[PDB]
């Protein structure tokens, strides 16, 4: 299971 | 923000007038987090060889880096961190994060340096984000 996508730079 | 937009907007974006041909973010288990529309089907042995090459630099160099069965010559990389390959005028950069693998595959007229720029800088951001 992929972790959540981090907030975009 | 989705994993797909990370590929679409931060890997497949314009770099000095050029674009990657394929790009993807993989978990180190070999699962796709997101990939471009025609990113090669990576074999389990290709993922295992990539993981081993990061753990032991020089593992793939004498035999070649393989992506979807396509052979790349291992060129200069960063031990434990960045794999770089060439196939004619094209090539590939694989940047390791703590949990993932960031892929970028390019063709001429895009250069290896432009591919390194987009792939390694996104991988750096994911590392700095705890991934």
Structure explained in plain terms:
The complex is a heterodimer of chains A (9) and B (131). Chain A is largely without helices or strands. By secondary structure, chain B is an alpha+beta fold. Helix content of chain B is 28%, strand content 29%. Chain B has a seven-stranded antiparallel beta sheet with strand order 2-1-7-6-5-4-3. Classes of the chains: A little secondary structure (9), B alpha+beta (131). At the A-B interface, loops of A face α1 of B. Chain A: Interacts with FIP2.
Oligomer: heterodimer
How large a portion of the residues of chain A is in β-strands, by DSSP E? under 5%
Q: Helical region count of chain A?
A: 0
Number of strands of chain A: 0
Q: State the major sheet of chain B.
A: 7 strands, antiparallel
**According to CATH, what is the topology of chain B?**
Beta-Lactamase
User: What fraction, in percent, of the residue positions of chain A are helical?
Assistant: under 10%
Instruction: Report the β-strand fraction of chain B as a percent range.
Output: 25-35%
Q: Which value, in Å, is the CA radius of gyration of chain B?
A: 13 Å
């Amino acid at each position: 299971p992929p972790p959540p996508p981090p907030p975009p730079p | 923000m989705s994993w797909q937009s990370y590929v679409d907007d931060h890997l497949m974006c314009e770099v000095e007038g050029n674009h990657l041909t394929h790009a993807a973010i993989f978990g180190q288990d070999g699962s796709v987090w997101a990939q471009s529309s025609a990113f090669p089907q990576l074999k389990p042995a290709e993922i295992a060889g990539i993981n081993k090459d990061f753990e032991e630099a020089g593992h793939l160099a004498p035999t070649g880096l393989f992506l979807g069965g396509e052979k790349y010559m291992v060129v200069q990389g960063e031990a434990g961190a960045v794999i770089r390959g060439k196939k004619g005028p094209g090539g590939v950069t694989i940047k390791k994060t703590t949990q993932a693998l960031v892929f970028g595959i390019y063709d001429e007229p895009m250069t290896g340096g432009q591919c390194n720029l987009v792939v390694e800088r996104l991988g750096d951001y994911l590392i700095e984000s705890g991934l």
